[PDB]
From a paper:
The MAPK p38α is a serine threonine protein kinase that is activated by stress. In other words, [name] is both an activator and a substrate of p38α. [name] is a scaffold protein, the N-terminal region (residues 1–370) is a pseudo phosphatase domain with no catalytic activity, and the C-terminal region is unstructured and contains a p38α and a TAK1 activating region.
Here, we investigated the role of p38α and [name] phosphorylation on the interaction by solving the X-ray structure of the complex between p38α and [name] (residues 1–438) in their phosphorylated forms. To this end, we produced phosphorylated p38α (pp38α) and phosphorylated [name] at Serine 423 (pS423TAB1), measured their binding affinity, solved the X-ray structure of the complexes, and compared these to our previously published data on nonphosphorylated p38α and a short [name] (residues 384–412) 29-mer peptide. Phosphorylation did not affect the binding interface between p38α and [name]; it instead induced major conformational changes of the activation loop of p38α, which contains the phosphorylation sites Thr180 and Tyr182. In pp38α-[name] complex, upon phosphorylation, the now-activated loop of the kinase swung away from the ATP binding site, freeing access to the catalytic site for other substrates. This loop arrangement is typical of active kinases. The crystallographic and biophysical data both suggest that [name] remains bound to p38α after having induced the kinase autoactivation and having been phosphorylated by it; they also show that no other region, beyond residues 384–412 in [name], was involved in the interaction with p38α. The structural data suggest that [name] does not dissociate from p38α after inducing autoactivation and becoming phosphorylated. The main structural finding is that phosphorylation does not perturb the surface nor the strength of their interaction, suggesting that pTAB1 remains bound to active p38α.
Residue numbers in the entry:
A (entry chain A): 15 to 373, 384 to 395, 404 to 410
B (entry chain H): 5 to 29, 37 to 248, 251 to 314, 317 to 352
């Protein structure tokens, strides 16, 4: 049942992806959980372009949910090519708030049934010592947990007549990559929402917490993102968790940060959208430092060798798995960092960069001369 | 148990006991030798491949056993080649033959209002009777409507029928005869769906062409709303993106079906209008429509039947359980004299 699925696909982009994997000890063999990543790449009539890459955790219900609903909130008339920049910022904020409100609304009934069941179990008694009378209630509690769980991070791009906009909630990334005669110039258009982000640190402080002990702990509840879509455990149960306990407002918000008006006239290159799992896995293999620069350059290479943008994106994802797999397998220094990697999604949007294969004498240092040697040490 | 025999048609084997012979086409004609007249045999396409197919199959048997109206088909014989609750994996339904379908008839024959005027009255007669048994049909198309040489008619195909409730299956009906309520408010419709298709069939059995041949479920809502107008927001507020989509489309004015279908029976206009609106509450029922101006030539008030039992078929059951309650229902049949 989907009101958005007739929408034409974008002809100037391609997507590569691979699921999570954990490496076996027995030798070869891997295991996986169901993939929690997603993407979209539509072009409305309007001539509006919308791209997204989505990183899910705790199951993939929320990731799918934000993928249908944000399309319906953006490509059904609410964007058009003559929209000023103020227009675009308003519409994106409206869209993201609708999705987060209706997801929370979608599970309030289930959350209320859960509490009524949980009160029907003997207080404190480990469920395993519980007799067969309760087995039906436990069954149901396992099923409700499955339909309310999940969260998602999102990075979204809007292109209207050469104006590029970016909307970000979380740790996925957006790289604009231009060609100069010097070479490829990479810049990250969005900022990572973690506890290392100085402005999130100020926002967390202004809700009454301790920027100091928040920076120190670094993670919250499994994830590093200080912004996520969905996840009832942090949007409702944050008052229980400590050193996050005495906050005046929701510490982890669903509001996008918008970065906007990139002129793209006379630009030659490509746009990258990638999920956290892609660049984390490369930083596990090579050390932290220059993953944006290194992934861009991988893409540069495949542009000259492959026949479509999808093959380009997918070849880079394939090279990063092998690098990670080899690293674990080689036993050395960094293998301890690669027992597993997460879902990988990579999306490439072309801005006039060329795709396809169809697209001396050396003088001596000091000259001779017909006519007690030493060298300087360093 | 009559000794069975096997014949291949359209690349499959049909194992049928004798009586019937000289097969010629999911359903074939035949001659039951115990009787002396031509009959139609229906082989169910896949009877228990999923849990929903077994519960679609179980219902099509249990409902046809229930209805007795000269306008709704009922079963003369039901059989299976299999022996016990093990070999079971096939059922056959066999009904007195008609020699024509409404779909083929309209694919090569202009047609008069007086033809129409009668066919629909017959339809609404069976419909009013089906609704007065607590059962919705859900699939009314020329393909599954049958007519005699005289032009007598009965309703076919209960593969898609169910005892009504507030909670129902969402993806339902053929596309062109799919009530807007089907898609604009998922799972929460009633039996007004059946009547919407009757209007759809009403003006097809006239003009000769499909009223709303939309390609996708989106193209379909666009076609329907460009003849009934857009929802003025009284009916609107549906759900979320459904709203959203409609707001994306321009204002279409409602039209009176007078300017619409030229040279009409203005008697029929008025019935077409009172049938194919959008507001489910404010629109005709088979009864209030039966007793209506258009059918004064034939109206003679058209009786109701008993209610359909549920008990079993409103619970969660396995692909086994659903097929056994089907077999326990094929084993217990009794023919009519
Ligand atoms: N009793 C009958 N008399 C004459 N023609 C019949 C009769 N029953 C079926 N037919 C013909 O068979 C066609 C399809 O019959 P249906 O009853 O719709 O079977 P079906 O649609 O294939 O089954 P499903 O799986 O429940 S949708 C009709 O269009 C008629 O041409
Ligand atoms: Mg009832
Ligand atoms: Mg049919
Ligand atoms: Ni993930």
């Amino acid at each position: 049942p989907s009101w958005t699925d007739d929408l034409p696909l974008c002809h100037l982009s391609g997507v590569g992806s691979a699921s999570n994997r954990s490496y076996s000890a027995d030798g070869k063999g891997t295991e996986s959980h169901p993939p929690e990543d997603s993407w979209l790449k539509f072009r409305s009539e309007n001539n509006c372009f919308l791209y997204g890459v989505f990183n899910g955790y705790d199951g993939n219900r929320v990731t799918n949910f934000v993928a249908q609903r944000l399309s319906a909130e953006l490509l059904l008339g609410q964007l058009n090519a003559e929209h000023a920049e103020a227009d675009v910022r308003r519409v994106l904020l409206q869209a993201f708030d609708v999705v987060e409100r209706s997801f929370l609304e979608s599970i309030d009934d289930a959350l209320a049934e859960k509490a009524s069941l949980q009160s029907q179990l003997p207080e404190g008694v480990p469920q395993h010592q519980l007799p067969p009378q309760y087995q039906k209630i436990l069954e149901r509690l396992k099923t409700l947990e499955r339909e309310i769980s999940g969260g998602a991070m999102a990075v979204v791009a809007v292109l209207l007549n050469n104006k590029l906009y970016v909307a970000n909630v979380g740790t996925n990334r957006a790289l604009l990559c231009k060609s100069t005669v010097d070479g490829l110039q990479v810049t990250q258009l969005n900022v990572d929402h973690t506890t290392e982000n100085e402005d999130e640190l100020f926002r967390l402080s202004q809700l009454g917490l301790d920027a100091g002990k928040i920076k120190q702990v670094g993670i919250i509840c499994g994830q590093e993102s200080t912004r996520r879509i969905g996840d009832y455990k942090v949007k409702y149960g944050y008052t229980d968790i400590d050193l996050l306990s005495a906050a005046k407002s929701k510490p982890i918000i669903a509001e996008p940060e918008i970065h906007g008006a990139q002129p793209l006239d006379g630009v030659t290159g490509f746009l990258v959208l990638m999920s956290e799992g892609l660049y984390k896995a490369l930083e596990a293999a090579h050390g932290p430092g220059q993953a944006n620069q290194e992934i861009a350059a991988m893409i540069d290479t495949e542009f000259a060798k492959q026949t479509s943008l999808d093959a380009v994106a997918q070849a880079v994802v394939d090279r990063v798995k092998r690098i990670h797999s080899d690293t674990f397998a080689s036993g050395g220094e960094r293998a301890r960092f690669c027992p597993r990697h997460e879902d990988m999604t990579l999306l490439v949007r072309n801005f006039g960069y060329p795709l396809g294969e169809m697209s001396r004498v050396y003088p001596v240092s000091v000259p001779y001369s017909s006519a007690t040697l030493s060298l300087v040490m360093p | 148990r009559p000794t069975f025999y096997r014949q291949e048609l359209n690349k499959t084997i049909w194992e049928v006991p004798e009586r019937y012979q000289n097969l010629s086409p999911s359903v074939c004609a035949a001659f039951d030798t115990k009787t002396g007249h031509r009959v139609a045999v229906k082989k169910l396409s896949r009877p228990f491949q999923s849990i929903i197919h077994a519960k679609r199959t179980y219902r099509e048997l249990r409902l046809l056993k229930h209805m007795k109206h000269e306008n709704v088909i009922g079963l003369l014989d039901v059989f299976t080649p299999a022996r016990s609750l093990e070999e079971f994996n096939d059922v056959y339904l066999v009904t007195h033959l008609m020699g024509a379908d409404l779909n083929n008839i309209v694919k090569c024959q202009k047609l008069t209002d007086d033809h129409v005027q009668f066919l629909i009255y017959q339809i609404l007669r069976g419909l009013k009777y089906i609704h007065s048994a607590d059962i919705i049909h859900r699939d009314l198309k020329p393909s599954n409507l049958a007519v005699n040489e005289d032009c007598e008619l009965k309703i076919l195909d209960f593969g898609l029928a169910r005892h009504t409730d507030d909670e129902m299956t969402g993806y339902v009906a053929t596309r062109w005869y799919r009530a807007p309520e089907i898609m604009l408010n998922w799972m929460h419709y009633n039996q007004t769906v059946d009547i919407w298709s009757v209007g759809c069939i009403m003006a097809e059995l006239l003009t000769g062409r499909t009223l709303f041949p939309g390609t996708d479920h989106i193209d379909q809502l666009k076609l329907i709303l460009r003849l009934v107008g857009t929802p003025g927001a009284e009916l609107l507020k549906s759900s979320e993106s459904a709203r959203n989509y409609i707001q994306s489309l321009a204002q279409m004015p409602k039209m009176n079906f007078a300017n619409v279908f030229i040279g009409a029976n203005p008697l029929a206009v008025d019935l077409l209008e009172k049938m194919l609106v959008l507001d489910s509450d404010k629109r005709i029922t088979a009864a209030q429509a039966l007793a209506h101006a258009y059918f004064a030539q034939y109206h003679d008030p058209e009786p109701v039947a008993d209610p359909y039992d549920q008990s079993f078929e409103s619970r969660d059951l396995l692909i086994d359980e659903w097929k056994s309650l089907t077999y326990d229902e094929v084993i217990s049949f009794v023919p009519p004299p």
